[PDB]
Design a protein around this ligand. Sequence first.
Ligand SMILES: NS(=O)(=O)/N=C1\NCc2ccccc2N1
Ligand SMILES: NS(=O)(=O)/N=C1\NCc2ccccc2N1
Ligand SMILES: [Zn+2]
Length: 257
Amino acid sequence: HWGYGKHNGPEHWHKDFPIAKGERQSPVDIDTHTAKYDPSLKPLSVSYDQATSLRILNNGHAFNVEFDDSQDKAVLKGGPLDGTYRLIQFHFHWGSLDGQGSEHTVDKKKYAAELHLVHWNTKYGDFGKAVQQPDGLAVLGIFLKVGSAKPGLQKVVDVLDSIKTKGKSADFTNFDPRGLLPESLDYWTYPGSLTTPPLLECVTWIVLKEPISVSSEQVLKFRKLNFNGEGEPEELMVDNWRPAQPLKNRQIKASFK
Ligand SMILES: NS(=O)(=O)/N=C1\NCc2ccccc2N1
Ligand SMILES: NS(=O)(=O)/N=C1\NCc2ccccc2N1
Ligand SMILES: [Zn+2]
């Protein structure tokens, strides 16, 4: 099945998922000089005060923190978006070393990790219908650089020992995703795709300009997770990122001057 290794990684995905070579694949390099300020854009509305986290799962690719998405509890609105997008899960991508790990790049710079908060457009009723639509998802992407600890990340770090291997999950209620956001909501946006198979071209990407800082010890703990299942040979969960893809006929817009 697909993964991040040399034999099943990003260079192989197109054989099972031919959209990997499509017209609106993600991630991309954000060339900051080429991105254009768009006064048509609004401020992003991130409304997470009623978020209800459920569980944290090691799915063999990353770990996902899942939310109750049966009601408008944690929603993204505004910015480039029409309508309301409900938070369903977040996850990260990270490297084996601090100089790599992000999916998006900024002027070719790679960050140590990237957070994806995944939301689906409520007009499509549920996530599985939303992924079939060109405006079905909005993913809020946040870069992580290594420096001071992020206090709002620590509860995630501290549960990772309980989900070390593929298929493990743990209760993860009462987690506040507001604690993962930087101060500024300035962003870049473009139309793209899921960055993992099935690579569906359903995403409005909103990538914040300001990274969050996390400590070397926090990201070290991400790198102790395993891709494998319990009882199988250990393969550390590192370098679970897709590299930048061709921009093709797209424009990246900036919310800021
Ligand atoms: N609304 S709910 O059932 O409590 N929460 C939901 N259901 C569907 C789903 C699937 C995967 C991840 C999160 C969620 N969230
Ligand atoms: N890294 S990403 O762009 O959020 N890709 C994702 N997110 C959501 C999701 C759920 C189910 C299957 C694949 C994917 N892929
Ligand atoms: Zn992702």
